[PDB]
Design a protein around this ligand. Structure first.
Ligand SMILES: [Cl-]
Length: 149
C-alpha cells in the first residue's frame, strides 16, 4: 500500500497548460514561471491565501502533447513588473518562483478517468490553463504521476 497522498489535508493544485516546449525547458532550468494575466492573478491569490500552511502544486502539460511533463510547487507571489520578452509570448507580464519536484512524461491515458466536478465533470486531461483541481481529485492525480513508470 501507498497512502501518502490520501493523508494530506491542505494543498491547492492547478493545471498548467503551456503552448511552448521552450517555456517548459526554461522553467525547469531556472525554477520560474509566468502565466497569463488572469492566470497569474488566480495563482497569486491561491499562494497568498495559503500562508505556508500547505503547498500550491502546478501540474504542467504542453498543449496538444498528449501527456503531462511534471510537477512544480509555487514558491513566491507573482511579481508583475519584470523583464519583458523572456517567454515564448514576448509580451508576458511577470514572474513567480517555482520549484520543480518531478519531471517525467505521464501519458493522458493514465489520468483521463479522473474527472473534475468544478469543470463540468470533464477529464482532468481536458483542462485549460490554471484550471484548479479539487483536493480529493488532486490526490488521485499525484499518486498516479508519482507511481507511473
Ligand atoms: Cl489575460
Amino acid at each position: 500500500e501507498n497512502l501518502y497522498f490520501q493523508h494530506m489535508k491542505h494543498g491547492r493544485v492547478f493545471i498548467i497548460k503551456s503552448y511552448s516546449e521552450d517555456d517548459i525547458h526554461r522553467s525547469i532550468k531556472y525554477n520560474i514561471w509566468c502565466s497569463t494575466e488572469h492566470g497569474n492573478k488566480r495563482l497569486d491569490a491561491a499562494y497568498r491565501s495559503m500562508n505556508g500552511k500547505g503547498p500550491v502544486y502546478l501540474l504542467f502539460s504542453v498543449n496538444g502533447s498528449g501527456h503531462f511533463c511534471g510537477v512544480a510547487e509555487m514558491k513566491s507571489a507573482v511579481d508583475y513588473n519584470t523583464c519583458a520578452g523572456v517567454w515564448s509570448q514576448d509580451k508576458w507580464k511577470g514572474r513567480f518562483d517555482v520549484r520543480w519536484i518531478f519531471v517525467k512524461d505521464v501519458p493522458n491515458s493514465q489520468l483521463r478517468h479522473i474527472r473534475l466536478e468544478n469543470n463540468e465533470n470533464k477529464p482532468v486531461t481536458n483542462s485549460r490553463d490554471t484550471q484548479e483541481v479539487p483536493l480529493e481529485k488532486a490526490k488521485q492525480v499525484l499518486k498516479i504521476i508519482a507511481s507511473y513508470k
